[PDB]
């Protein structure tokens, strides 16, 4: 019961999900072979077999075969299913048009076949969790196509997208703003929660708070996997306050157009500073609420908080959670919006976080991840649409998009609905 199906679209999605899955196997005591050497708690992520073998409830799907083939040749070859591990022959080439109209159409059919088989194997499917980067091609085009098909097939079933948006300055691709503004369609219409995981915030967090000279995408994905494990532990393990996907879905999403939600996690500390600090619940809550520990590059002070959901793991106490809430309410720099008095969701779990061997996170008896919807997130859309307007003012890189079965008006309608996003963000943030 309460199972959730993982989808990993694109290179970024596949790598993030692969870190997530090593973390899940380590947390549940599952070897890379896929067995327990020596309790229905793993069921929400792994499906049992008559031979006592565990298979992840995941679908890796990339239009290019390098990452998926290398995962196949990797350590978890016996863990991951030979199917639900789809590899293409030519990538989307960082093009929304290629990913959504030329190459995604010849693969989304078998993608839906795999998803349907996973759903049939499942029994209590809580929802889908999709990991992808909106700045790439496959994570944009194929992601939008798969989200469309899932919306028209599974209906109102929950779909949470742990997506990696462009960062304000640390960006890899040039047409990445195009890919983001065009994936805004799907990430606005056919998903219910969208959690931003931009790389610049991860980088600055592991710089000023975790203290390793040269972490990389591996550490980024490990921390993201820790975050997603914190979110899913409420249903994975028993606790004082247990919340499923739909439990916090409505508590976090106030309006259908308002579902892009910031994130943060703490304590993100190293072993050297772990044993000299009394990481109390109030301390970790304050660290999460401070922008120092915020997981997406956006300043909360420029906007107003609308609804937070807190996931505490470990020996956290229901006294400590609402004592931290009271201290936060007394605090003035963390201002909630006027029309949402409570603004708080709390879920406490009795399972302390597990640290991956050879990683950078230190073993802590308690942790907390905040997923918070706030009006301040209008800035990421404002900067991405400003970049889109600057590049689109004289049609740069648009011939690549329009030569692959895309119309001129698609960019215009992307600008239209992104515009409606900043306007309704501003208008719901405006005081009564």
């Amino acid at each position: 019961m309460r199972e959730a199906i993982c989808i990993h679209i694109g290179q970024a999605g596949c790598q993030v999900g692969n870190a997530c899955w090593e973390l899940f196997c380590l947390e549940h005591g599952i070897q890379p072979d896929g067995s327990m050497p020596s309790d229905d708690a793993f069921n929400t992520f792994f499906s049992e077999t008559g031979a006592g073998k565990h298979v992840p409830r995941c679908l890796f799907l990339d239009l290019e075969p390098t990452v998926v083939d290398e995962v196949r040749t990797g350590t978890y070859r016996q863990l991951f299913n030979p199917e639900q591990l789809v590899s293409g022959k030519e990538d989307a080439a960082n093009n929304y048009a290629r990913g959504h109209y030329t190459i995604g159409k010849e693969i989304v059919d078998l993608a839906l076949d795999r998803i349907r088989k996973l759903a049939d194997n499942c029994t209590g499917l809580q929802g889908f969790m999709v990991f992808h980067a909106v700045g790439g091609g496959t994570g944009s085009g194929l992601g939008a196509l798969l989200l469309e098909r899932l919306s028209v097939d599974y209906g109102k079933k929950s779909k949470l997208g742990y997506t990696v948006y462009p960062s304000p300055q640390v960006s890899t691709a040039v047409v990445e703003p195009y890919n983001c503004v065009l994936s805004t369609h799907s990430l606005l219409e056919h998903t219910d929660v969208a959690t931003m995981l931009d790389n610049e915030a991860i980088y600055d967090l592991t710089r000023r708070s975790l203290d390793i000279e040269r972490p990389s995408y591996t550490n980024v994905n490990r921390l993201i996997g820790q975050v997603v494990s914190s979110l899913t532990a409420s249903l994975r393990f028993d606790g004082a306050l247990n919340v499923d996907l739909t439990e916090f879905q409505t508590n976090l999403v106030p309006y259908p157009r308002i579902h892009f939600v910031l994130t943060s996690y703490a304590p993100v500390v190293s072993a050297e500073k772990a044993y000299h600090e009394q990481l109390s619940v109030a301390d970790i809550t304050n660290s999460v609420f401070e922008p120092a520990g915020m997981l997406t590059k956006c300043d909360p002070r420029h906007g107003k908080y609308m609804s937070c959901c807190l996931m505490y793991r470990g020996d956290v106490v229901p006294k400590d959670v609402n004592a931290a809430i009271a201290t936060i309410k007394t605090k003035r720099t963390i201002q909630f919006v006027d029309w949402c008095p409570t603004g708080f969701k709390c879920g406490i779990n009795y399972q302390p976080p597990t640290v991956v061997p050879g990683g950078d996170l230190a073993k802590v008896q308690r942790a907390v991840c905040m997923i918070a919807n706030s009006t301040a997130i209008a800035e990421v859309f404002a900067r991405i649409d400003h970049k889109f307007d600057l590049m689109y003012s004289k049609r740069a890189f648009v011939h690549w998009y329009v030569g692959e079965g895309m119309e001129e008006g698609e960019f215009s309608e992307a600008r239209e609905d992104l515009a409606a996003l900043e306007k309704d963000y501003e208008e719901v943030g405006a005081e009564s």
Binding site: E22, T218, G358
Partner: protein, 37 residues
């Protein structure tokens, strides 16, 4: 015809105590090195 040697070769890799070993260490992948058991 003569072509110069060492232009496209770093000394730390090519010549040293364990050149084959350092080459083998280099020729692995990031997933292989970071993700092990």
């Amino acid at each position: 015809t003569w072509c110069a040697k060492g232009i496209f070769e770093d000394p730390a890799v090519t010549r040293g105590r364990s050149p084959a070993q350092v080459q083998a260490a280099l020729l692995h992948s990031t997933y292989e090195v970071d993700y092990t058991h």
